[PDB]
Symmetry: C3
């Protein structure tokens, strides 16, 4: 390489060396009563890897710094500890293969681990992970004690309107296929037989079901209505609406009403509890 | 240090200075009709901090770029504004101490803030945060107006099968200890007394409870069944099942049924609403 | 990498405008494997995934707050009590 050397009357020194093969620069200094320092190389992308979310491959492609496989014979928690010990990275992305012990979820997942201090002997941090079905899981570590993973449920608004309980045999569309859901909420809006304090509106009431594959899901219940007096107790009534689901459609199958007022199905929400 | 100085016949200048203490290089230039520039230091990892999720400490360890403490006497919203004003970071990680005013949650938490433009006078952005219990919270800022924090609920499937209401005194396992949950969903699958439009299946119906510590949680209600005619209204019936929980187990305590057909408990889901 | 999506974009994580993080380990768009986490203008959370360039349906998370707790008797009719947040911040 080319060496540029400087030396003073007190034996302070500076050496800059540029490699004749690669064109990389290296620098070193010496004090009057000291040795030279080790050669400081010029800066390169790979010197940032401890602070990035991604590892830098030899082709300059970007990947996860942590990959955890069932062949490693390690838990997710020990893979995090080993990764923090090997790299000193505090915030980083990860992949975990399905079936890894202590994994955020049973399926394969990808996620982000976040912490402010790489102390594996008293680790403090959090993670957020997403599965091959789009499920969300979150969790934390506190003094190297690990909390149980918190799986989120999820939902979609499938249908909204006002379908009368008397409109039996009517079919309507859904915003998604019902087979994408394990649970459903059916919302019903009612007027009671008598008025209570001058109102007969009940609000809009949820019925939640597991999608067992039944030819009818049955919303049924009771109202108490009318104001209590010393001579008259409040009256009681019963109601039903039956509904069914098929692909991106739903049907009002049947109903029962014990008064002359119109009763409605008004919202349908698809639910997953993975 | 060592100064390498260059100066042309027109008074263009280049000064390269290397510090005799640290071995860091500094460069300055002057034009014929100008002054010297400020000293441009050599490149270092700290010069990237505006674009990273992590800060870089003096020992070269990673940490969060935002740490918020109750001693700071600031809201979380003001700590975000101060951080964006101090650093120009649009996407970054954070820690918030429990009891910080306007915090995503009451306990201590760790999270990610995301935005595309560091404009604190009309801030547009979002956050995701995780607590010391593993709870998840999300929120937004829109024209520097801040929305209320959205805490997500979480769940686990504790048991599934088909246990008859008549099987009173029977006990079964749960996939986790019930004391890990504040709420429970108990699912019941029923056949009605009469058929309606040729079906008596109700689907599988949710009963949701807060885990107040009761010795029985009482799933009870009604069905309407049969087909209406001008001479015969649909009939009515009542039902009950009582359940209890003890560590990693549950028991079918009692039941009532007003028809001869089998009624079942079929799912138990543990729920947290933190 | 991070992303912004405008409200009304086809196939968006949500109908409103949103901001989020996409995560993957290999840039193969002919067999793309990865996940996303997104947040809306109201603070809603949505997650989803891509697997062999097949796209999964977006999973919107619900949310809650404890507004009130105690033991108000059914006989205390006409009594008004406070909530920890405004009810207009909730749909259910």
């Amino acid at each position: 390489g080319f060496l540029d050397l400087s030396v003073d009357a007190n034996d302070n020194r500076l050496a800059r060396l540029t490699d004749a093969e690669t064109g990389k620069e290296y620098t070193s200094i010496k004090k009057p009563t000291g040795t030279y320092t080790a050669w400081k190389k010029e800066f390169e992308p790979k010197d940032m890897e401890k602070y990035l979310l991604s590892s830098i491959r030899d082709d300059g492609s970007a990947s996860f710094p942590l990959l955890v496989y069932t062949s490693d014979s390690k838990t997710f928690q020990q893979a995090i500890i080993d990764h923090i010990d090997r790299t000193g990275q505090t915030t980083f992305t990860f992949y975990v293969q399905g079936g890894v012990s202590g994994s955020p979820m049973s399926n394969s997942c990808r996620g982000l681990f976040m912490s402010d201090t790489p102390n594996t002997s008293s680790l403090h941090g959090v993670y957020n992970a997403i599965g091959t079905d789009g499920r969300n899981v979150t969790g934390s570590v506190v003094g190297s004690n690990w909390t149980s993973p918190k799986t989120s449920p999820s939902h979609k608004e499938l249908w909204t309107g006002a379908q009368s309980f008397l409109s039996t045999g009517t079919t309507k569309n859904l915003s998604d296929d019902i087979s994408n859901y394990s649970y459903v909420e059916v919302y019903t809006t009612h007027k009671t037989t008598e008025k209570t304090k001058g109102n007969d509106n009940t609000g809009t009431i949820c019925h939640k079901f597991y999608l067992d594959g039944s030819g009818t899901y049955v919303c049924s219940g009771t109202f108490v209505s009318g104001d209590r007096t010393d001579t008259k107790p409040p009256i009681t009534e019963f109601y039903r609406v039956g509904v069914s689901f098929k692909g991106s459609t739903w049907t009002l199958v049947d109903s029962a009403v014990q008064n002359s007022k119109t009763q409605y199905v008004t919202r349908i929400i698809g639910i997953n509890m993975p």
